[PDB]
Structures are given as C-alpha cells and as structure tokens.
C-alpha cells in the first residue's frame, strides 16, 4: 500500500499554512498613512485554537472512541499556558522581524530542552547532541549578523516557552499515557478559553472587529489559515494510523527542512547572498541531529 498521500497532505497543508501566516502578519495594509499593520496576534491565535479544538473533537469522535483519557484536567492547563504563550510570542515576533527569522527560531527547538537537560538538570548528553546545538548556533549567528530589538527577545521567550511545553508534554505522556488527539483537543480548549478571557478583557476584540471593518478581506484568509493549521495536525495523526511512528519521525524530520527551505528561497525574500550562506550553514547543522536519532 503506497503512502504518498500523507506526505503530500502534510507538505501541502503546513506549507500553505505558512504562506497564509506570512500574508496575514507581514501583509501590507493600506497606503500612505493607512499603514495599519496587523498587531492583533491574540485574535488569530484564538481562532486557530478553536478551529484546532473542533477538528480534534471530530477526530476523537471518529477514531479510538473506546479510549479513556486518564490525564488530569489541571495538567492540561499547565501545558496550555506555555503553549498559548509560545504562540503569542512567536506570532508577535513577526511584527518586528522577517518571516525567515521566525521559522529559523522555530527550528531552534532543541536548544532550550538540551540546555535544560545538560546544565539545569545535570544530565550528560552524547557527542552528537553537544554538536547539533553548536552547528545551529553558528548558522543562526552567521544568519543574524550582516539592549537588543524586541524581535530577538520575543523569539527567545517563544523558544523558552516551547521548551517548557515540550517538557510538560513529555512528562504527561510518560506518566498518563495521554493520547495525541486528546492532548491536542484539551490544550486547544484551555488555550482558547484563556485567550477569550484575555482578548475580551483587553478589548482588542472590538478593535479587531473595527480593523476587519476597515479591511473586510482579512477574515477569508484567517479562517483558511486556521483550517490549514488544523488539517496539518489532522494529517500528521493520519500518518501514524496508516503506519507506525517510523514514518512519523521521517515526515517530521523532512518537514523541518522543507518548511525552512520554502520560507527562505521559495518565499522570494530580498535576501543577500552574504546572508543566505548562514541559512546554508544552519541547514548543515539542521538534520544532523536526526542523523543519530
């Protein structure tokens, strides 16, 4: 049984998701004095979270109905706070730095968890791990160079919260056998609840509605962005169903390279060659960790 459909699906869902995200965040709005840049990162994350929650509910209703979720409710909130914070920090970063920087920062996930395990928890790591971070750091340092700006601090906070979310998810999976769909649904529900509370409290839901009134065309794009975000995870899960995790690791590893490649060159940025080499070197750093698993 050939399985190109899942690989395709992922590469056609998350790729377009990135395209819509770039359009929504960095998209030029207005002319002259009408340059009202998209500063409403909370509302889009809220929409994405609710769409993900509904899709996960559908998947649960259609798959593994017999499974019983043993995870405690308060566990989901603890991971969800960092999950939501990581999204808010990452999406907000687009307000100050170009898309390639954000995606590369997202590819920098190993450093937080690796740093924690090696220096905070005092756990030795193999040689390959101790060199993956070095290669990635060299690549990003070359890429970055031509107090600090908000974009870099936002990216750092996003990485820290992503590491915290990863460790919390690891703990809950280990000690509660939480399913993929159940965790997705629950963390999305908690995130959307907290985001609704905050957004209505801060009031920019009204201001976001005003912005939509000024530019009505945004709503058709934000909905599609959320739908693609949900479908990406839905098809990622489908890969496990069709075939075991051996394919899941491969698809994740190849996506972590294809997404950055497309966002770098296929996005048609005005990148100078002096900068592209840095992307090349971080590529030579990226994936090398997956070489040793």
């Amino acid at each position, epitope marked *: 049984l050939r399985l190109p459909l899942c690989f395709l699906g992922v590469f056609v869902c998350y790729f377009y998701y990135g395209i819509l995200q770039a359009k929504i965040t960095r998209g030029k709005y207005g002319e002259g004095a009408k340059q009202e840049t998209f500063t409403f990162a909370l509302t889009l994350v809220f929409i994405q979270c609710v769409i993900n929650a509904v899709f996960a509910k559908i998947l649960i209703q259609f798959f593994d109905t017999a499974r019983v979720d043993h995870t405690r409710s308060w566990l989901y909130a603890a991971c969800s706070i960092s999950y939501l914070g990581a999204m808010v920090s990452s999406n907000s970063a687009l307000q100050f730095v170009n898309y390639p920087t954000q995606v590369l920062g997202k590819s920098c996930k190993p450093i937080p968890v690796m740093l924690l395990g090696v220096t905070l928890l005092k756990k030795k790591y193999p040689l390959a791990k101790y060199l993956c971070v070095l290669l990635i750091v060299a690549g990003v340092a070359l890429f970055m160079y031509k107090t600090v700006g908000y974009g870099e601090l936002l990216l750092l906070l996003s990485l820290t919260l992503d590491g915290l979310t990863g460790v919390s998810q690891d703990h809950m999976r280990a*000690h509660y*056998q939480t399913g993929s769909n159940h965790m997705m649904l629950n963390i999305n529900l908690w995130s959307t609840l907290l985001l609704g509370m905050g957004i209505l409290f801060t009031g920019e839901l009204w201001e976001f509605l005003s912005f939509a009134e000024r530019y009505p065309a945004i709503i058709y794009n934000i909905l599609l962005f959320g739908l693609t975000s949900a479908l990406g995870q839905s098809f990622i899960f489908m890969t496990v169903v069709y075939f075991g995790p051996l394919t899941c690791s491969i698809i994740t590893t190849t996506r972590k390279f294809f997404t950055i490649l497309a966002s770098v060159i296929l996005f048609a940025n005005p990148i100078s060659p002096m900068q592209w080499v840095g992307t090349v070197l971080v590529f030579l750093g990226l994936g090398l960790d997956a070489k040793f698993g």
Partner: single-chain antibody
Amino acid sequence: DIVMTQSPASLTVSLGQSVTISCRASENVEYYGTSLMQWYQQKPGQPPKFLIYGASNIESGVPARFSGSGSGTDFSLNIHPVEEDDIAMYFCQQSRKVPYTFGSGTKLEIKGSSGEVQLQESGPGLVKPSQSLSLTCSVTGYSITSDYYWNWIRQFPGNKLEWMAYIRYDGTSDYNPSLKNRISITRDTSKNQFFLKLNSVATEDTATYYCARAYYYDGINFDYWGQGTTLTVSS
C-alpha cells in the same frame, strides 16, 4: 489481549536469601519509554496489597527490600533480605491494554515446614444458574465523586485474578471486552455506593469479588481493596 506468564510457580526460600520473580508479557508493554507494570502481594485469605508501579517505583510505605527491574516484555521483582512477612503470593499486572490482566501468581514458601477509604462488598452468597445478580460496594470515609477510579475485580479458585470493570468519578466507565455484554456497572452517589450487575451467571462465575479504589499513574494501581465477597453459583 496481553498474557502474563510467571515462570516460577512456587519458590522455596530460606530467610535472608535474595529471591527474584520473573514475569513475561506477550506484547511489549513499553509505552513512551515507561513500563506499565504493577506488582501485588496477597497473603492467604486477604485482598492484594499494591507494592510497585512501573519499574522500581516503590509505593510509599512499602519496605525498601522490594525492587522492580526489567523493561520491554520481561520484568522481575527482587526481594534481597527476604523475611517472614514477605511469604505470600505475588502477582504481576500490566496496564497497557484496556483489559488489565494479572499473572497466574508466584507463591513463596519456607522449607522445613480514618485517613483512608473503607470499602464493603455485599451480595447473595449462593445463587442458582441463569439468575441475574447484583453486588453492592459501599464506600465510607470518602466520596466516590472525588478523583479516584472504582473497580470491580474477581478472583477464581486457584488464585487467578480478572479485572471485571471500573467507573471513574466523572461517571466514565470501562468494561472488560470479554464481559462487556454480560455485566453493567452503575453508581449511586447519594448513598455512596456502586453496583455491579451480572446477567445470567453461569457455573464459571464462582469466585471472590473485590471492589477496589485505584489511581492512574504509570498505569492503574489498585491501591485500596475491600474485604471481598464470596459468590458460589450452583444448581
């Protein structure tokens, strides 16, 4: 489902010796690098007492003598300074598949021969075949609406355990697939009880039924047990 095999059926030990009990599962019980294994110690005519969950995670209050080991499909339990108290039966349980299964049990013998929950089982003793039956487990000192699983388990003659079913405090209930069409578990929170109803009990159902309180961590651990009620089905 997963079958657990305990190779040493009966172990003859002398006090002070180090004893190891082996338990092999049919399928890999590893889930995300965590073993979903538990161990229980049963004295004659007593409910099992929970000892270990996963790999070497000794339950609080258990002596330091016991230690679990092994991963994948093969597991072992080691008692290095064996003492008089440890002479009992030992059961290995897996919590990787929705039917939780216990091993046949390994029996040790010696040569030369309010801060808790009170569970109380009740039900008819002797029953004719084909009659519907209903056992009631009443809980005192705790509210079944608080966070704890409440399970019905049974033990046939020969000391073979079989997890019948359970109900969670949310009202979510899980059944043994082999018995999903013969039993039903319900609860009454007003009186703090839960009932197990069996339809058309046959001679094979003769056994001792326990109601237990369990908490999920590294699997399912039946920490608290009732005294158990004997049920005999005969014509």
